[PDB]
Design a protein around this ligand. Structure first.
Ligand SMILES: [Zn+2]
Ligand SMILES: [Zn+2]
Ligand SMILES: [Zn+2]
Lengths: 126, 140, 118, 105, 235, 111
């Protein structure tokens, strides 16, 4: 047998543990606006990227390209799940920085999809 | 596949032989009985050929040495071929010297079959010509 | 490619070109890994392309039967089996050109001592 | 098994692979572990006969020597419909036995 | 080839090509093939009478299959490619898997040679070659038109005009020249030998597309890999 | 006649390469049908497409030529509606048409 057969149980098989993703979707306090749905085809991404890079870089106190690219990779799907993104960032950032971070990245993407150009308002200004 | 696993694979070849109780007439080394050439690999680059001969002489008398070197710079690639005067010294050296450490680096010593000598078409050096045609050896 | 047998040939179309280029180009320690990968990709692929790739990789394996390098021997036994499954090899070709160096270089006493090689 | 509470079944969607039983497990039911009255043939899910594992024992995992069945009582209760019945974890009992013999021997 | 020779003779009003007087009359089989080559380009009817298409091509000093393909097919860009049809720097204007496309950006950037590894002679003639073909199109009311996509526009022309040259190395319905994986069908300008069969200046083309254009001349499936189990094998 | 066990809706691929059986909600299964060399029908293991909290009104197989088999559906998601005490989310949730593609290369069904 090239590996062992036994590799541990998956979460669909094993009832001894509760679903930690659902449990965190209950008890973390999420930001006010994350329920609005986002379409990423209507959003221009590479203009969004330098702000994220800068935002994560100053929160972290250094630059972590794995956290950067992780955030970018989560935004590649058509409808990005915002609550899972705040959960998945809570480990790296404070969990208070993650809430603020989504609280500014998310209305920015909303402003971007309302535009025709793909560009949010504060970036059209400047 | 890392070189250290090659060093371990030759050693496990020997330990496995001991566990099974194989006789020396049918040992793995008996496939290389015809040749008296052994590959040494993983050497430190600081070692010169006097060092190699100085150490591998514990098991017999070295007839020829081929520490292969870079063509442009001349520095050592790290591997060389040694010919012993006795063929049985190859058995002794592959068993005893495989995986020892010299300057903090483990080396692998394995039997080499049908070793083919370098052609003297190049006139790059003279001492190499002397080594090829005549080679190191005691003179009466 | 081992895990996906026999599916995904269309997913692996993107890497067939650098893999091939490396097998023709590289010599040395890269060749063992690249040759392993191409040997697993051969059963995934359909008969027309399999008959192509098996012939040239058969020519590489004939050259590599000589090689006194342990990873190369572990690789080319497997790849011999994988190219022997396809129908693009001929029985005459195998017993004329694979078979004598195969039984001269692989049926040895040191091959029988390691369990994976055995 | 019914004797080990910490063992866990695969329960994925079973397929066309037939599950088999090693000499030790021959003649017993995969669910309730009985020796009598075999009613239906066991099917295992695709992942569980992947590769080298093709044809091993359903209940323990050893070389399989005959086909596995469900008994009549597990058929009537429709226990044969829950999924792949391959056991996916060794459990405490198997592991303890190994370390105990190895300590001694 | 006798193909264009026929379109020039049948223009002259010669109703018998068998007994016409030449000093050394050509093979009768080469005539029948040439007569058959103008057939499938729709330059003639079934009984050998000229069509509106065949009468038009004779105004072009071209091989009729090529001219026909261009006309049928991108008119400004066919005017570009067909004129041309009569490795580092190569890469920039050379799109992968095609030769007309490579030629396309060749001329297009010419009016936009030494440093690009191109010949000022070949292009200066092609500049005049394209010049004269335009005068011949306008004269007889061949419309000047452009399409949104050139690759789509040019691919169709090659399939039509040159259809007699298509390969499934490859097999004609031959090996590639040193000139240039999903694609299995090709269209090619010219054929040549040195030690082998060589295919020159080629363009990828689906088998299905060719059938739609030339049904008479030409007169992928997703299937599951694994065979499953029958009822007997299951228990 | 269970609520989640398939059997209610049944759709076949118009070329005849797959069949798809689904329950009223959250459970679908595709079977790949084939012919062996003795011209006998062979069946595969089921490929599953499951989507929780989701109602199916009808499922029909789409006539794509010899591409990967498609199946079309009249789905609806009741997940949001059971969490709105005001009852608005029941009112303005809407039915979707979703297309499932059976990727015969990768042996799996993708929504
Ligand atoms: Zn068992
Ligand atoms: Zn039972
Ligand atoms: Zn299973």
């Amino acid at each position: 047998m090239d590996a062992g057969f036994f590799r541990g149980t998956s979460a669909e098989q094993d009832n001894r543990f509760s679903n930690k993703q659902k449990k965190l979707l209950k008890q973390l306090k999420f930001a006010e606006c994350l329920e609005k749905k986002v379409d990423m085809s209507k959003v221009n991404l590479e203009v969004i990227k330098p702000w994220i890079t800068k935002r994560v870089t100053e929160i972290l106190g250094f630059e972590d390209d794995v956290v950067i690219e992780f955030i970018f990779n989560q935004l590649e799907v058509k409808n990005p799940d915002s609550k899972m993104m705040q959960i998945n960032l809570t480990g790296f950032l404070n969990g208070k920085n993650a809430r603020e971070f989504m609280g500014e990245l998310w209305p920015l993407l909303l402003s971007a999809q309302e535009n025709i150009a793909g560009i949010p308002s504060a970036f059209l200004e400047l | 596949m890392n070189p250290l696993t090659k060093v371990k694979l030759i050693n496990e070849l020997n330990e496995r032989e001991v566990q099974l109780g194989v006789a020396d007439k049918v040992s793995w080394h008996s496939e290389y009985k015809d040749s008296a050439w052994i590959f040494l690999g993983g050497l430190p680059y600081e070692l010169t050929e006097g060092d190699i001969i100085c150490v591998f002489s514990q098991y017999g008398e070295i007839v020829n040495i081929n520490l292969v070197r870079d063509k442009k710079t001349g520095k050592s690639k790290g591997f060389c071929f040694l010919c012993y005067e006795d063929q049985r010294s190859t058995i002794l050296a592959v068993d005893n010297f495989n995986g020892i450490k010299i300057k903090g680096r483990t080396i692998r010593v394995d039997h080499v079959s049908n070793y083919r000598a370098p052609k003297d078409s190049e006139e790059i050096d003279d001492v190499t010509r002397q080594l090829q045609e005549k080679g190191c050896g005691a003179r009466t | 490619a081992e895990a996906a047998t026999p599916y995904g040939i269309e997913s692996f179309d993107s890497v067939l070109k650098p893999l091939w280029k490396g097998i023709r180009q590289h010599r040395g320690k890269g060749l063992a890994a690249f040759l392993k990968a191409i040997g697993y990709l051969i059963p995934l692929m359909d008969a027309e392309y399999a008959n192509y790739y098996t012939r040239e990789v058969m020519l590489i394996l004939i050259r590599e039967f000589q090689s006194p390098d342990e990873e190369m021997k572990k690789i080319v036994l497997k790849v011999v089996k994988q190219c022997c499954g396809t129908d693009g090899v001929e029985a005459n070709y195998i017993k004329t050109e694979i078979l004598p160096p195969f039984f001269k270089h692989f049926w040895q006493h040191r091959m029988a001592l390691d369990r994976r090689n055995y | 098994a019914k004797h080990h509470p910490d063992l866990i079944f695969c329960r994925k969607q079973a397929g066309v692979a037939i599950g088999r039983l090693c000499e030790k497990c021959d003649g017993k039911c995969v669910i309730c572990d009985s020796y009598v009255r075999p009613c239906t043939l066991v099917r295992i899910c695709d992942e569980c006969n992947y590769g080298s594992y093709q044809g091993r024992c359903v209940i323990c995992g050893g070389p399989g020597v005959s086909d596995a069945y469900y008994c009549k009582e597990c058929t009537i209760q429709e226990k044969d419909r829950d999924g792949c019945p391959k056991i996916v974890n060794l459990g405490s009992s198997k592991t303890d036995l190994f370390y105990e013999r190895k300590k001694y021997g | 080839s006798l193909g264009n020779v026929v379109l020039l003779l049948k223009s002259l009003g010669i109703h018998d090509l068998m007994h016409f007087d030449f000093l050394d009359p050509p093979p009768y089989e080469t005539l029948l093939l040439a007569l058959e080559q103008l057939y499938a380009l729709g330059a003639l009817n079934h009984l050998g009478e000229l069509t509106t298409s065949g009468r038009k091509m004779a105004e072009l000093p071209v091989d009729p299959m090529l001219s026909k393909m261009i006309l049928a097919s991108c008119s400004e860009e066919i005017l570009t490619v067909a004129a041309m049809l009569s490795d580092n720097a190569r890469v920039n204007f050379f799109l992968p898997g095609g030769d007309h496309l490579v030629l396309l950006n060749v001329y297009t950037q010419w009016a936009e040679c030494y440093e690009n590894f191109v010949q000022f002679r070949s292009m200066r003639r092609a500049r005049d070659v394209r010049e004269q073909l335009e005068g011949l199109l306008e004269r007889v009311e061949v419309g000047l038109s452009s399409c949104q996509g050139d690759y789509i526009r040019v691919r169709k022309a090659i399939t039509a005009g040159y259809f007699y040259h298509t390969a499934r190395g490859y097999r004609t319905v031959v090996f590639i020249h040193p000139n240039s994986q999903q694609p299995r069908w090709l269209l090619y300008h010219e054929l040549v030998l040195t030690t082998k069969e060589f295919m020159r200046q080629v363009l990828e083309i689906e088998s299905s597309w060719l059938l739609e254009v030339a049904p008479h001349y030409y007169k992928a499936k997703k299937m599951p890999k694994k065979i499953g189990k029958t009822r007997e094998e299951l228990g | 006649c269970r609520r989640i066990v398939p059997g209610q809706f049944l759709a076949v691929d118009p070329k005849g390469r797959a069949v798809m059986i689904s329950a009223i909600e959250k459970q679908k299964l595709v079977y790949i049908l084939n012919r062996d060399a003795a011209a006998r029908l062979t069946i595969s293991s089921p490929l599953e497409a499951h989507k929780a909290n989701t109602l199916v009104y009808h499922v029909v197989g789409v006539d794509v030529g010899f591409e990967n088999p498609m199946f079309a559906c009249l789905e609806m998601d009741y997940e949001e509606a059971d969490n709105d005490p005001t009852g608005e989310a029941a009112a303005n949730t809407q039915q979707t048409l979703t297309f499932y593609e059976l990727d015969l290369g990768l042996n799996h069904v993708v929504r």
